[PDB]
Amino acid sequence: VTRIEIRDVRPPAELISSMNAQMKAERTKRAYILEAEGIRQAEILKAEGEK
């Protein structure tokens, strides 16, 4: 009747880094976009000053 479970699935140490690099990379995207927005607004303001 078991409903056979796998209690735990361990990869070795080498594979874990490769597996969580995905989510680290997905996090860097948000930071990059936010920095881009900051740059955009700063440039607009400086242009007004120069005008």
Written as one string, the DSSP assignment of the chain is ------------HHHHHHHHHHHHHHHHHHHHHHHHHHHHHHHHHHHHHH-
Which of 13, 19, 31, 47 is in the footprint of another protein by CB under 8 A? 47
Say whether residue 8 binds another protein (CB under 8 A): no
With respect to another protein, which residue has the nearer C-beta, 14 or 50? Answer: 50
Return the residues of window 24-43 that contact another protein according to CB under 8 A: 43
Question: Under the rule (CB under 8 A), what is the footprint of another protein?
Answer: 43-44, 46-48, 50-51
